[PDB]
Design a protein around this ligand. Structure first.
Ligand SMILES: Nc1ncnc2c1ncn2[C@@H]1O[C@H](COP(=O)(O)OP(=O)(O)O)[C@@H](O)[C@H]1O
Ligand SMILES: Nc1ncnc2c1ncn2[C@@H]1O[C@H](COP(=O)(O)OP(=O)(O)O)[C@@H](O)[C@H]1O
Ligand SMILES: Nc1ncnc2c1ncn2[C@@H]1O[C@H](COP(=O)(O)OP(=O)(O)O)[C@@H](O)[C@H]1O
Ligand SMILES: [Mg+2]
Ligand SMILES: [Mg+2]
Ligand SMILES: [Mg+2]
Lengths: 172, 533, 536, 525
């Protein structure tokens, strides 16, 4: 048992394919782990790729919130639909916890999750909103509660109007 | 053929977490059982031989006492019927100040006997009607059972003797000393005007020297220090300021606009000169103690030290108001020097330490003043808290005596006489309400029974002796605590007396709670969900 | 962990002593509430819904799951007391635990355990001598009242305590029934020969004492009669079935004409045996083995009762009582198979009695010896089980009283007298063994204290009055009759227990003291414990 | 037990009721008292406790050990509370209170098990404690002539007795004399804040010193500080609460100018303000300048150029002590630096003390304060030394307030036990057993002393009992000679109020523990 100076040398450069494949897979799991860790412990104490690349994409100047649910979820979903009908500029969406594979404590004691993302960072991590909001409050109550913290953003055509750059020229 | 489906109708429409208890057996009997359980938990702390209970609340704070209201407050009661009885007990505590355990025991006995009456065949309406009739009869009887009156409240010995019984149930071993302390403290307050203020009694808990070292102080004691270097004044002329002891500033925004070097060089000097002038003007009125409700500026403190002015900083507005009442000053809103009328006067103000606590004492040599303080010593925080609860009970008893001066015999004598006379009345009453009236009369036995059980003697012998004596004609005879065997003695001679108003209110509230619990027939409980507070 | 390097936990010094004393105190406090007439029974659930209502200390300690080994030591101490005496099972455990507690209290004062052990041994020896010399009453001057009172005292605190006036009489009659003498002329009473049958139904008063033997068995077939007016009992230890050839024998057939004869003989052998048995006039045939259909039919045709699968102990008791002889085989010394009338047991009557929808065999008034059996009736099975346990305790107490003709006053009188005498005597023996003997005397006072506290009475005042009475008896020669003053828990005052009829066998107290002292000495030797971790 | 459809209390509520509850409470009190059993007497040991953070504390003080223990038993916390009470009111005997309370409970446990009503036990404790307190008061030895030398000897002996149980017991005479000298300089209130205690690493215990003035560590000197002289033979000290630095005149101040001449004038005005403050300080005649607020580098260089000493960010307590020693006043404004507000010490010096720099203000003739400089080999060594010095200081303060003493070593305990037993012989008998149990429990102190010292407690206790019976009220345990001796003649003296408070607190704790019959634990929130 000697030769502590192994100096693997040519090994890493000769098997770099498998090492880089494993590194890529581990990093792919790493973005998911970093995204999910922002919710657990950080706020709990006090397909997944679709969610990941939806959070990564879109403009940082648009507030995007997501909801974590398991099968009063129905009332909050109806209120969220009403807010979506009232705030077309926002992109309300929901995703199951089992798809994300969050912790068991979040599944068992944090079923109602109001996660708000603004430019890749958590400006709001409302979790287990049963106590401070209720069970059967309407959409206007949720809108007022969210607007009190300054998070939510502040005619009707017939059906549609939108359709070279030569607009119109009468010049001879 | 292996499952029982829910009945069509209300059972199917019920929420997943809700509960529905309907009918006599499912609701009334369960409520009576819960109330009996609560009475059983609180029963052992009744009377002078009652035992303290160490109750640890949800916040992990230790409470040791035999005060029923405190025990119920610290307990996390969940049954709605027991909740209602606890509300009745708290209402009794707020209205009078003593008799909460009496209310709970009487309500439990009444509900147990109501359950018995329901079982033998009587319906809820007959029981409620009989209980109300018997309560009216007891309220009519009670004035006739008054044995004596206070007849003097400016005395010390009489007040101490009157208050001994109230603070005999709590702190049974040493009640005379506490009675004398509370009597002196209450006599200092309560001037020729008939109005007596309970809040004017202040209790300060200083730890270290045992409760036998407690004393009463005519003034205020604050557990803090003095800002300045002056620590003792012999002819104090306290001036009280609600504003901070500092130069007044604007409300919108104060910007020091400097446009020349002269202003820059002279601004600080002018500010210091203005502060010095203000402090000297304050001191020139003869005021040598200054009490502020806000912060103290460094320059203001320096100039107060230069002119030999004692500075005391009170943080809470309640303490400021109490000190103003005690000394006789007015809380000025600005730093202007006080006029003669607004200037307070005290016999002595000094800094001192008791045990290891630095305190500031506002001491009056005269045996008068609006506010008097009781300095409680002790070897444990919980012991001093229990002594403070006893002091509160004694002060409430004194206030009740001021409101109504009539007293009734204690030691269950009043309860036995009431039971006997209500039983006699119920015999003459025909109809089905006689059973309810007799049960209401028998429910008064729970007080002497609890006293006998706590004292360690057989209850049945005591009850039989009390009935025999009251049939003889002595209506002022209750059980003797200082006896190893069941025995009775005259309470009027022994001075074991409790207030008539307390008994009246306790009986009324207990009867109201019992009948209100009996009136409920169906319970529709929602899902507990959350709601931590 | 450390320099010792052993794969287990270790405890040394006052820690292990405190642990052992705590375990002993836990065992004592488990059963302390079930001592004395004002004691109460206990209800045990066996994790599968089984209920065992009991008051016996041995049963309680045996049914429990015990892990600490000093607690075990007390458990087998109670079991040993039950096996060797039959009574005082709770008292010995309580006394041993109190002795251990006081010995540990002495040890904590830097008194060496050797001195405490020597003092305990000396105190036990002197207590036994004092009991045997001063605190015994000879039963030859009383007769049957002493037996009745001893049985009633044993039955107190049991489910049959109030019915003692009847149960004690039944027990005394049953014990006197089975009395017989052996070599050297000493009369010995073989308890456990009184068969006890439990059957719910009627009240306790309908419990009956059979002047014979009772079998928990029924007749083999419904055709045979269920009552014989003059029983000729023949006891057999072999089954009566078709004869099967042994393992070392085979039947090989080369001539077909022999198979039918072989098959016929295969049952004709048993038929001939049964005919030989029946030709002597036997009416009742009891066998430990089974009986098949053909033999049952033969007995039915003969008009004789036949019972199969009889328990061996029951068969032995029946043979002893009725004068029958157990015959494991029908083979004399002449090489033949014969049955003689000399082996026929005789009983006055055998009846297939019916008891609460079940039936059992009653063998009434056996000759050449008298035997007894008791059938207990109760509300349910738990009540009957408790009745059986209390009945066994009473039978053992009566056995001890009849064997050794000395009794002691009950109700803690012996304990108080011993405490006073040992406290006075300790001043003349050694220096630290003085303290040891004083602690022994003080520990002997736990029994009257428990008796008084179980009645919700003033234990301190009652024990003080008892001690004053015993001290006055000891210091005043003319007041020597106060030794019998014990405790009356009904009224909570001292009472002359010998006059009141509260008696206990002397052997109970002597064995309890000896066993408790030895157990306390054994536990006190420990000063260090190594608890090796299990290999799994 | 049956499941009610709706339960009464909250789910998970635990309730213990009856005699088993009180027995468990007594056992818990015994367990707590066992944690400080071996830290009693001159042969007592120390306990090491490691908190969750990994920091370790080493102490012989019972109150400190109990506080560092995370006691959660409701009945056991009373022992910690009474230990804190004894520490607060007296400062010594924090182990005796716990031992006495636990011994009372252990003595009455057998009577509790027998079903005796606890009110009788409480009454017996109250009666016995009142009698014992009266006996202590009327047998305590006091001298009604108050000579300076005799009072000095009494205080020194009391400090020696209080100190002869810690790691500084070998130098107990030196530290006792230092404590007495320190205490006598306090004027009338004997504030503990007027006795500074500085701990400096490195050095023997005998190297610790008491300064007749003030001393504090050097506080973040700026540039140019090393050029200032570090010794003055009659300095005048300017005690100030002033920030001597270039800074904005006020936080909300704003300067508005529209001319370069005004810009230069503003800069020169700021410089002139600072230099005016510095000149006002300098012209006062002071040579040493101290301030709570920071002193800038410009001011440091200015004072260096004038051969002056400066020190900024001096703590409030250090300046208060310096004012009480030199005799000046802390000035928030330098506009009136009259000669009557300047401190004056004989010698000021900065010296190297064990790898640290300290400023010494010695030679103050009318100083009302002092500073302890404790040396040691470790931080916990210094902390335990400070705790022992605090105990001695509290004892000396109490003796100054009331100079009544009783011989220690268990002599007073044995005398009280004998008196209480003799009283118990003359009562009907129900209270007699309880009072005798109280008297026997009073014997815990000498027994614990003998056990810690490795003696045979039984023989020593028998000899003490016989001696007290035949006469001699001041006979206690003599640790050095393996025997008993007259402790009063051996100068084992403690103030009577120490034992009075110990008995009172132990009796109150025992009565409170016994009075409880039932406990309730609400579920965790
Ligand atoms: N010395 C005494 N002797 C007999 N009874 C007393 C004595 N002191 C008080 N009592 C009785 O105790 C009762 C007070 O019980 P208490 O514990 O105060 O309950 P509550 O606080 O609900 O009034 C009174 O009704 C009185 O009759
Ligand atoms: N009628 C009685 N009166 C007074 N004491 C009795 C009576 N019967 C029994 N005792 C006493 O009660 C004690 C408890 O006996 P018990 O517990 O029934 O026996 P075991 O310990 O075998 O269960 C015995 O020592 C006996 O002296
Ligand atoms: N030199 C000594 N000889 C005998 N006993 C002593 C001596 N010094 C102190 N003691 C005893 O040791 C006991 C404990 O004192 P100490 O350990 O200093 O503080 P605490 O009382 O807080 O434990 C005191 O009651 C005292 O009587
Ligand atoms: Mg009250
Ligand atoms: Mg028995
Ligand atoms: Mg000390």
């Amino acid at each position: 048992l000697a030769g502590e100076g192994i100096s693997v040398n040519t090994g890493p450069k000769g098997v770099i394919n498998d090492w880089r494949r494993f590194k890529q897979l581990e990093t792919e799991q790493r973005e998911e782990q970093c995204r999910e860790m922002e919710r657990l412990i950080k706020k709990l104490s006090m397909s997944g790729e679709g969610f990941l690349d939806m959070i990564d994409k879109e403009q940082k100047s648009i507030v995007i919130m997501v909801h974590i649910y398991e099968d009063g979820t129905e009332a909050m979903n109806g209120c969220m639909i009403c807010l979506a009908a009232e705030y077309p500029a926002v992109k309300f969406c929901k995703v199951k916890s089992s798809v994300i594979g969050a912790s068991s404590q979040f599944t068992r004691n944090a079923l109602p999750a109001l996660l708000i993302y603004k430019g890749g960072e958590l400006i709001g991590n409302f979790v287990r909103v049963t106590d401070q909001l209720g069970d059967d409050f309407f959409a206007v109550d949720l809108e007022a509660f969210l607007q009190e913290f300054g998070l939510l953003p502040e005619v009707l055509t017939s059906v549609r109007n939108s359709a070279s750059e030569d607009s119109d020229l009468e010049i001879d | 053929a292996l499952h029982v489906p829910k009945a069509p109708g209300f059972a199917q429409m019920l929420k997943e977490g809700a509960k529905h208890f309907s009918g006599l057996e499912e609701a009334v009997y369960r409520n009576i059982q819960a109330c009996k359980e609560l009475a059983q938990t609180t029963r052992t702390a009744y009377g002078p031989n009652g035992m303290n209970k160490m109750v640890i609340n949800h916040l992990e704070k230790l409470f040791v006492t035999n005060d029923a209201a405190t025990i119920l407050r610290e307990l996390e009661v969940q049954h709605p019927a027991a909740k209602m009885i606890v509300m009745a007990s708290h209402m009794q505590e707020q209205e009078v100040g003593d008799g909460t355990n009496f209310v709970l025991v009487f309500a439990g006995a009444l509900l147990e006997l109501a359950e018995e009456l329901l079982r033998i065949g009587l319906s809820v309406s007959e029981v409620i009607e009989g209980y109300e009739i018997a309560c009216r009869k007891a309220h009519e009887i009670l004035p006739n059972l008054v044995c004596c009156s206070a007849k003097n409240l400016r005395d010390i010995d009489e007040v101490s003797s009157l208050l001994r019984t109230s603070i005999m149930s709590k702190q049974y071993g040493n009640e005379v000393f506490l009675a004398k302390l509370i009597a002196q403290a209450c006599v200092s307050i309560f001037p020729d005007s008939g109005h007596f203020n309970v809040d004017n009694i202040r209790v300060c808990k200083i730890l270290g020297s045992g409760i036998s070292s407690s004393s009463v102080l005519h003034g205020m004691v604050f557990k803090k220090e003095t800002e300045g270097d002056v620590t003792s004044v012999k002819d104090a002329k306290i001036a009280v300021y609600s504003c901070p002891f500092d130069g007044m500033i604007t409300e919108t925004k104060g910007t020091v606009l400097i446009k020349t070097a002269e202003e820059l060089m002279n601004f600080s000097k002018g500010e210091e000169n203005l502060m010095d002038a203000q402090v000297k003007a304050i001191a020139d009125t003869g005021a040598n103690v200054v009490v502020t409700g806000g912060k103290v500026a460094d320059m203001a403190l320096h100039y107060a030290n230069k002119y030999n002015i004692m500075l005391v900083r009170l943080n809470s507005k309640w303490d400021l108001r109490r000190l103003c009442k005690t000394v006789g000053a007015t809380a000025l809103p600005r730093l202007t020097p006080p006029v003669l009328e607004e200037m307070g006067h005290c016999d002595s103000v000094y800094l001192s330490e008791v045990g290891d606590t630095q305190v500031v004492v506002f001491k009056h040599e005269k045996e008068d003043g609006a506010i008097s303080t009781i300095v409680l010593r002790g070897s444990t925080d919980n012991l001093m808290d229990d002594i403070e609860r006893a002091v509160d009970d004694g002060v409430n008893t004194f206030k009740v005596l001021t409101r109504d001066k009539r007293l009734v015999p204690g030691g269950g004598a009043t309860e036995i006489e009431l039971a006997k006379q209500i039983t006699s009345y119920g015999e003459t009453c025909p109809g089905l309400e006689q059973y309810a009236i007799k049960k209401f009369a028998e429910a008064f036995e729970a007080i002497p029974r609890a006293l006998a059980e706590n004292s360690g003697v057989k209850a049945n012998e005591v009850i039989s002796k009390l009935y025999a004596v009251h049939q003889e004609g002595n209506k002022n005879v209750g059980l003797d605590i200082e006896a190893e065997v069941p025995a009775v003695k005259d309470m009027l001679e022994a001075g074991i007396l409790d207030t008539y108003l307390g008994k009246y209110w306790a009986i009324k509230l207990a009867t109201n709670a019992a009948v209100t619990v009996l009136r409920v027939d169906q319970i529709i409980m929602a899902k507990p969900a959350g709601g931590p507070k | 962990e450390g320099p010792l390097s052993v794969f287990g936990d270790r405890s040394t010094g006052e820690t292990i002593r405190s642990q052992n004393v705590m375990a002993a105190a836990s065992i004592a406090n488990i059963v302390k509430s079930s001592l004395g007439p004002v004691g109460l029974d206990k209800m045990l659930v066996d994790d599968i819904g089984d209920v065992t209502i009991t008051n016996d200390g041995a049963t309680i300690l045996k049914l429990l799951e015990v892990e600490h080994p000093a607690a075990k030591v007390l458990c087998e101490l109670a079991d040993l007391q039950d096996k060797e005496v039959g009574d005082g099972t709770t008292s010995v455990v309580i006394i041993a635990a109190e002795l251990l507690k006081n010995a540990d209290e002495l040890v904590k004062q830097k008194i060496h355990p050797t001195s405490v052990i020597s003092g305990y041994r000396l105190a036990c020896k002197e207590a036994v001598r004092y009991i045997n010399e001063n605190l015994i009453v000879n039963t030859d001057e009383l007769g049957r009242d002493c037996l009745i009172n001893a049985a009633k005292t044993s039955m107190s605190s049991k489910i049959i305590g109030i019915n003692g006036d009847f149960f004690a009489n039944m027990v005394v009659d049953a014990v006197l029934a089975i009395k017989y003498t052996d070599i050297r002329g000493q009369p010995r009473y073989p308890v456990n020969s009184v068969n006890i049958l439990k059957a719910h139904g009627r009240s306790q008063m309908e419990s009956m004492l059979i002047s014979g033997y009772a079998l928990n068995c029924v007749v083999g077939s419904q055709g045979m009669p269920k009552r014989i007016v003059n029983a000729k009992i023949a006891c057999l230890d072999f089954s009566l079935q078709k004869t099967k050839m042994k393992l070392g024998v085979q039947v090989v057939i080369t001539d077909p004409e022999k198979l039918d004869q072989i098959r016929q003989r295969e049952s004709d052998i048993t038929k001939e045996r049964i005919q030989k048995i029946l030709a002597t006039g036997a009416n009742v045939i009891l066998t430990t083995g089974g009986i098949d259909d053909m033999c049952l039919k033969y007995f039915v045709e003969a008009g004789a009762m036949a019972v199969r699968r009889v328990l061996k102990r029951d068969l032995k008791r029946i043979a002893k009582a009725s004068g029958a002889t157990i015959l494991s085989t029908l083979a004399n010394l002449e090489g033949e198979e014969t049955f003689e009338a000399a082996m026929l047991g005789q009983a006055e009557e055998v009846v297939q009695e019916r008891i609460c929808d079940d039936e059992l065999i009653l063998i009434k008034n056996t000759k050449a010896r008298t035997s007894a059996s008791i059938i207990l009736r109760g509300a349910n099975d738990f009540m009957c089980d408790e009745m059986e346990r209390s009945l066994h305790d009473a039978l053992c107490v009566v056995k001890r009283v009849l064997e050794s003709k000395s009794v002691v006053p009950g109700g803690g009188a012996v304990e108080a007298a011993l405490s006073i005498y040992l406290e006075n005597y300790a001043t003349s023996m050694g220096s630290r063994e003085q303290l040891a003997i004083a602690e022994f005397a003080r520990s002997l006072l736990v029994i009257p204290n428990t008796l008084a506290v179980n009645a919700a009475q003033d234990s301190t005042d009652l024990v003080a009055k008892l001690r004053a009475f015993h001290n006055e008896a000891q210091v005043n020669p003319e007041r020597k009759n106060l030794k019998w003053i014990g405790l009356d828990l009904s009224n909570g005052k001292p009472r002359d227990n010998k006059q009141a009829g509260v008696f206990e066998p002397t052997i109970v107290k002597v064995k309890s003291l000896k066993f408790a002292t030895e157990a306390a000495i054994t536990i006190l030797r420990i000063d260090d414990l190594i608890k090796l971790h299990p290999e799994s | 037990m049956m499941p009610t459809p709706v339960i009464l209390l909250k789910e998970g509520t635990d309730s213990s009721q009856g005699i088993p509850q009180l027995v468990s409470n007594i056992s818990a009190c015994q367990v707590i008292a066992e944690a400080v059993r071996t830290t009693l007497g001159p042969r007592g040991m120390d306990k090491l406790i490691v908190d969750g953070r990994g920091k370790a504390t080493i102490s012989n003080d019972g109150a400190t050990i109990l506080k560092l223990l995370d006691v959660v038993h409701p009945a056991a916390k009373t022992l910690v509370d009474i230990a804190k009470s004894q520490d607060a009111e007296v400062g010594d005997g924090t182990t005796s209170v716990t031992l006495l309370a636990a011994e009372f409970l252990k003595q009455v446990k057998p009577y509790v098990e027998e079903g005796l009503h606890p009110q009788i036990i409480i009454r017996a404790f109250r009666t016995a404690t009142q009698l014992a307190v009266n006996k202590i008061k009327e047998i305590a030895v006091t001298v009604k002539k108050a000579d300076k030398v005799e009072q000095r000897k009494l205080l020194e002996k009391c400090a020696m007795t209080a100190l002869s149980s810690k790691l500084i017991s070998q130098q107990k005479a030196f530290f006792a004399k230092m404590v007495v000298d320190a205490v006598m300089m306090l004027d009338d209130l004997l504030q503990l804040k007027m006795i500074g205690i500085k701990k400096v690493q490195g050095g023997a215990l005998e190297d610790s010193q008491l300064v007749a003035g003030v001393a504090f560590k050097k506080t973040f000197s700026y540039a140019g500080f090393e050029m200032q002289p570090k010794k003055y033979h009659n300095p005048k000290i300017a005690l100030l609460n002033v920030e001597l630095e270039l800074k904005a005149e006020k936080d909300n101040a704003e300067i508005r100018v529209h001319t370069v001449e005004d810009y230069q004038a503003i800069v020169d005005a700021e410089w002139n303000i600072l230099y005016d403050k510095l000149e006002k300080i300098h012209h006062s005649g002071a040579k040493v300048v101290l301030s709570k607020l920071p002193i800038g580098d410009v001011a440091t260089q200015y004072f260096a150029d004038r051969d002056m000493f400066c020190a900024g960010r001096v703590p409030e307590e250090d300046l208060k002590r310096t004012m009480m020693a030199c005799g000046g006043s802390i000035q928030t404004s330098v506009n009136a630096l009259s000669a009557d507000v300047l401190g004056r010490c004989q010698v000021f010096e900065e010296t190297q003390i064990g790898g640290e720099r300290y400023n010494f203000f010695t030679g103050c003739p009318k100083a009302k304060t002092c500073t302890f400089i404790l040396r040691g080999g470790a931080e916990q060594f210094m902390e335990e030394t400070e705790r022992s010095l605090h105990d001695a200081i509290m004892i000396v303060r109490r003796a100054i307030k009331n100079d009544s003493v009783v011989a220690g070593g268990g002599a007073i305990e044995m005398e009280l036990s004998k008196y209480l037993r003799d009283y118990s012989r003359t009562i009907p008998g129900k209270q007699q057993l309880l009072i005798g149990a109280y008297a026997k429990a009073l014997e815990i102190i000498p027994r614990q002393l003998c056990d810690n010292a490795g003696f045979d407690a039984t023989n020593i206790l028998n000899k003490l009992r016989a001696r007290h019976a035949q006469g001699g009220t001041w006979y206690g345990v003599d640790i050095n000679n393996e025997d008993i001796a007259d402790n009063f003649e051996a100068f084992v003296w403690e103030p009577a109020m120490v034992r009075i408070n110990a008995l009172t607190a132990a009796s109150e704790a025992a009565c409170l523990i016994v009075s409880v019959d039932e406990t309730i634990k609400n579920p965790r929130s």
